[PDB]
Every structure is written in C-alpha cells, then in structure tokens.
C-alpha cells in the first residue's frame, strides 16, 4: 500500500502501532529512506481534543531544535479530516525492549538514564511537565533513547509510575518520581509497587509513608542513592532534574 504526505509519496512497509483512532506505520519515501508515519482520525474529534493535538504537535516541532533526545518530526499534513506526521523510525519502544530482555547492562542502563534526563529536562525548560511517564513513552533509536510525546495530546492507564501528588487528587518533581520508577524497573526488574495486584491497595501504598519502598543492596551504590532520591514522597524533598544531571551516578565512570 501507499500514501502521500504533502508532495512526497510513502510506501507502507508494516504497521508499527495503533493508539485507537491513531495508526503508526513504517514507511519508505521516493529516495527509499525509512520513516514512521502517524495517521490520526479527526472524524470524531472535539474542539478540545483538536486543540490538544495541535498543541502537542507545535511543541514537538518547537523542541526539535533543542534536543536530539526528542523524536525527529520531518513533516506533517493536517486537514479537518486527518493528521499525517513524518517522524524518524526507531527500533523499539523501551517498554517492549525491557519486557523482552532478562538482563540489562549497567552501562546500557546508565546511558539510557542520561538520555531520559536530557529529554525530560528539555520539555521542563519550555514549561512542560509530562505528568505521565512510562517506558512506553521512550523509543530506542541507534542505542539512544528518545521521548515520543509530552503527554499534552488526549501501555496506558498504569498507576505503577504515578507520583503521590497526582494520586492525592503537579510540578517537574512529578516527572522525577516517574523517571525513578523507570530506573527502579531497570535496576530491580519490577516497579516499586508492582508487587501489589489490587489497584486501590496499590494506590494506598504510594501515598502511605509507613509503607517503606525497599532498595535491595547493589554494587552500584550511587544508583541506589538516585532511586532513593527520585522515590522521596514529598516533592519538596525530591531531587530536581538539574541536580540529577550533576549526580555521581550520571557523571562518574
Ligand atoms: C510513534 C511510535 C514509534 C515511532 C514514532 N512514533 C517510531 N518508531 C517506533 S518503533 C516502536 C514504536 C515507534
């Protein structure tokens, strides 16, 4: 099959993912280069959803120039009926990659972490708080992690990465909580609260200071401190991203 985004023609190779009303495909242009096209159906879209879409796009377009850890958006076609986005094609999302591999290399992880701070830090600088980070939001492209979205436009639902303040009902400290959970999953093989099935009981645990989050002793003592810093329930007493980018775990060999 085929499709035309603006002037250019893109041959469909396979379907990467489907959000629901959205379909992501892997494509080829006339110069035979591989891309990822996102189809969005505006047929049953409120003017609020429309606005979230337009906002999320402009931001993704604006933030292209700032960080290389933000998915390349090459071109787009937008009508009253649909959205087409010509983005860079990654190998796999962090979630599926983590879900498959049993052993994660301390370097691969330290590297991925550094890429995760750079991405979140850039959206933060422009005023954005992602508010709902998950490994699904990150995409590996040439051993380099890239942020897919900014959680502006309307794995999903998962409360395992939710900060206590989001549950108590939101500042950059909320994204620090989530990022730490991601690291905790790449460190301990589970999210801090993955151990508790019942979603209501899982929620009571995040907001419970007496329910101690365990940090089992590891060779990377620095990595343990980062987790201990990110997973502090009081946003007031949680590490900031500029502070994390200067932590020994990230800076020291
Ligand atoms: C959304 C999702 C992806 C993308 C661009 N937008 C590019 N490559 C890949 S590989 C697995 C998911 C995706």
Q: Does residue 148's CB lie within 6 angstroms of at least one atom of ligand 1?
A: yes
Structure tokens at 213: 């989050």
Residue 21 assigned ligand-binding role: yes
Alpha-helical runs (H) found in the chain: 47-62, 94-100, 106-125, 164-167, 172-188, 199-206, 221-230, 241-244, 248-251
End-to-end CA distance of the chain: 49
Atom of ligand 1 nearest to the CA of 90: 8
CA 83 remoteness from chain centre: 21
- Domains of the chain in sequence order: 3-91 (3.30.200.20), 92-253 (1.10.510.10)
Q: φ, ψ for residue 247 (rounded to 5)?
A: -75, 145
132 tagged catalytic: yes
- The three-point CA angle 76-81-83 to 5° equals 20
> Which of these is catalytic: 51, 105, 132, 225?
132
Helix residue spans in 150-212 (DSSP H): 164-167, 172-188, 199-206
Give the Å distance between the CA of 36 and the centre of ligand 1. Answer: 6
Residue whose CA lies nearest to ligand 1 atom number 11: 92
**Backbone phi and psi for residue 110, each to the nearest 5 degrees, phi listed first:** -55, -40
Phi and psi for 137 in degrees, rounded to 5? -65, -15
Cβ pair 5, 86 in contact under 8 A = yes
Given CA atoms 123, 126, 127, 128 in this order, what sign does their dihedral have?
A: negative
For residue 172, with 0-12 CB atoms within 10 Å meaning exposed, 13-18 middle and 19 or more buried, which class applies? buried
Evaluate whether 122 touches 63 at the Cβ level (below 8 Å). Answer: yes
What crossing angle do the helices spanning 172-188 and 106-125 adopt, rounded to 10°? 170
Order of strands, sheet of 144-147, starting from the edge strand that comes earlier in the sequence: 92-93, 138-141, 144-147
Helix (H) or strand (E) holding 36: strand 34-41
How deeply is 210 buried, as exposed, middle or buried, from its count of CB atoms within 10 A (0-12, 13-18, 19+)?
exposed
Instruction: Tell me which residue of 222, 40, 51 sits closest to 153, measured CA to CA.
Output: 51
């Amino acid at each position: 099959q085929s499709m035309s985004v603006k002037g250019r023609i893109y041959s469909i190779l396979k379907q990467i993912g489907s959000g629901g009303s959205s379909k992501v495909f892997q494509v080829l242009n006339e110069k035979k280069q591989i891309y990822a096209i996102k189809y969005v159906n505006l047929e049953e879209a409120d003017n609020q959803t429309l606005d979230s879409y337009r906002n999320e796009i402009a931001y993704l377009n604006k933030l292209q120039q700032h960080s290389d850890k933000i998915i390349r958006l090459y071109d787009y076609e937008i009508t009253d009926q649909y959205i087409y986005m010509v983005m860079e094609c990654g190998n796999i999302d962090l979630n599926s990659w983590l879900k498959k591999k049993k052993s994660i290399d301390p370097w691969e992880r330290k590297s991925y972490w550094k890429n995760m701070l750079e991405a979140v830090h850039t959206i933060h600088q422009h005023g954005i708080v992602h508010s709902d980070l998950k490994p699904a939001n990150f995409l590996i492209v040439d051993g380099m992690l890239k942020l897919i979205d900014f959680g502006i436009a309307n794995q999903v639902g998962t409360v395992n990465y939710m900060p206590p303040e989001a549950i108590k009902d939101i500042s950059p400290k909320s994204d620090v909580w989530s990022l730490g959970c991601i690291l905790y999953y790449m460190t301990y093989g589970k999210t801090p609260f993955q151990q508790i099935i019942n979603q209501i009981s899982k929620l009571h645990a995040i907001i419970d200071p007496n329910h101690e989050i365990e940090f089992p002793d590891i060779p990377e003592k620095d990595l343990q401190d980062v987790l201990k810093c990110c997973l502090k329930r009081d946003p007031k007493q949680r590490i900031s991203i500029p502070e994390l980018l200067a932590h020994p775990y990230v800076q020291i060999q």
